[PDB]
Amino acid sequence: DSYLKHQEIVLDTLLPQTVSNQWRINNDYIRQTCTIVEEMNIQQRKQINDLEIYRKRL
């Protein structure tokens, strides 16, 4: 019965190690998403500016 408790705890340690590295990868992705999403926002604003600018010139 004691052996089975040593066997069990080992599995749940790996559950945490996987849990941490899985959340850690997603954590890095998050920053990337927010980096570019801003850059795309910057692009679209500039896009809309030309769109009306070119009209108001003509």
Add this chain to the structure above:
Amino acid sequence: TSMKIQFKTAMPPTEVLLESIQSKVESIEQLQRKLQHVQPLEQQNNEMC
């Protein structure tokens, strides 16, 4: 005679063991079920990792 003598001893040895060991079986068997869930989560986390 043997069947009588032996199986009476067996039933006494069994029920004496069972009283002590059915509790320890449940202890040991409910722990086994924990491996079967500790494993099944392990794979989904590895897969998702």
